[PDB]
């Protein structure tokens, strides 16, 4: 699984439970192409998202739908959603982990990258 | 002043100068528009983005370019650029942003 | 100003009002010895804890009690208090800290 | 395992590996007594801490090593480590996953509770 994320939520102490979150590839033309969607699991992971051989070297968006998620709790939020934009696998394949960790206010977001 | 930018820098302890950033306001077509754009000074702040008669409700999004940034240190970051996308709701904003080169957080305080 | 603290509240994104703390000093016998103390303010700020005449090199600990702040506002939070436990080294210190209730952040910013 | 801490570092994006920590407990006399220690995995987990009888309900701290972890990377950070204070088990026992992310200025923790 060569790209994996993972949200919590800093209000509950809880996972980040059904976040849904789009991930685009940047085109040849500067556009973004969508690349894979889906939602978070009861552990606050989404697995499956693409192969070893689709995830090819690029310019990747992660947009993760907190507003959505907070609304779905009737939290009103600030951000509409927390966007995580990388190059990946320019060196080669990596494995990319992308932690995110939500308040209504506020999100910080990190990557472990792995060979 | 409507909308200020604090950047600070977790790997120094330092506000994070001369940080280019671009705010783009979302059009009715779902297209970003260009809206302002500036570099933060020597305490890390951008002041005078917009003004209170311009900055109408509406969604906007400031591109934060970090790896500009940390490639100017010498060090490989992670992301393209750190992006804060929100509503401006009419119902003063202070985006912050603390830059790791594989990490980063943001936060909003919004006062009267 | 030696020493400031700034507190956030991430949850309702506003400075953390009102948040009490605690500065200790490490003594010769290891253990804490109370140095200076306050309340946040109105912006969130602490201010006026200690003099560069006093604020010698040593071990400094910040107890923030997170836990009242949080109770005071009828949410139930996790920590008992943020720490922030540093050297400070003769080699202008502001300390902040960003609160949720089953998280904080905190960094330094040391400047001239 | 009802105590467990993964403690991640945001300058390399891995795993912090070798992190020591130590667990006190708050005795009767609010001294802080030893309750348990150990060092981060190579995926920068401690398990196995503590067991469900030995972990009861009290005030624990968790103190994590950050500064030894920098400094052995030559790094000097600014704090002396990372310490996460906490009251465990005073509505029965629960599970607790302490995460904690490093950078030499700043680092966030976070705590995710389970039943
Ligand atoms: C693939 C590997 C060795 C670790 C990737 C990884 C993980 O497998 C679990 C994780 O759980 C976490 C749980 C938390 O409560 C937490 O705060 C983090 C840190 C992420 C932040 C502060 C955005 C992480 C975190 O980054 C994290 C994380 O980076
Ligand atoms: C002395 C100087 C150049 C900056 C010190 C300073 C400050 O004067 C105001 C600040 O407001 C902030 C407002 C925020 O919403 C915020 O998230 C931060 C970042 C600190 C965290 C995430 C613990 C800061 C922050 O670090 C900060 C900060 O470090
Ligand atoms: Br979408
Ligand atoms: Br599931
Ligand atoms: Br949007
Ligand atoms: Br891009
Ligand atoms: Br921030
Ligand atoms: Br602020
Ligand atoms: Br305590
Ligand atoms: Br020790
Ligand atoms: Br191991
Ligand atoms: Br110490
Ligand atoms: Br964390
Ligand atoms: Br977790």
């Given at each position: 699984?060569?790209?994996?994320?993972?949200?919590?939520?800093?209000?509950?102490?809880?996972?980040?439970?059904?976040?849904?979150?789009?991930?685009?590839?940047?085109?040849?033309?500067?556009?973004?192409?969508?690349?894979?969607?889906?939602?978070?699991?009861?552990?606050?992971?989404?697995?499956?998202?693409?192969?070893?051989?689709?995830?090819?070297?690029?310019?990747?968006?992660?947009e993760?739908?907190?507003?959505?998620?907070?609304?779905?709790?009737?939290?009103?939020?600030?951000?509409?959603?927390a966007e995580v934009?990388?190059?990946?696998?320019?060196?080669?394949?990596?494995?990319?982990?992308?932690?995110?960790?939500?308040?209504?206010?506020?999100?910080?977001?990190?990557?472990?990258?792995?060979?």
């Open positions: 699984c060569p790209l994996m994320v993972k949200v919590l939520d800093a209000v509950r102490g809880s996972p980040a439970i059904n976040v849904a979150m789009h991930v685009f590839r940047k085109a040849a033309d500067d556009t973004w192409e969508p690349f894979a969607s889906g939602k978070t699991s009861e552990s606050g992971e989404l697995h499956g998202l693409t192969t070893e051989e689709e995830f090819v070297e690029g310019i990747y968006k992660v993760i739908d907190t507003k959505s998620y907070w609304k779905a709790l009737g939290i009103s939020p600030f951000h509409e959603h934009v990388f190059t990946a696998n320019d060196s080669g394949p990596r494995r990319y982990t992308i932690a995110a960790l939500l308040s209504p206010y506020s999100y910080s977001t990190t990557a472990v990258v792995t060979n």
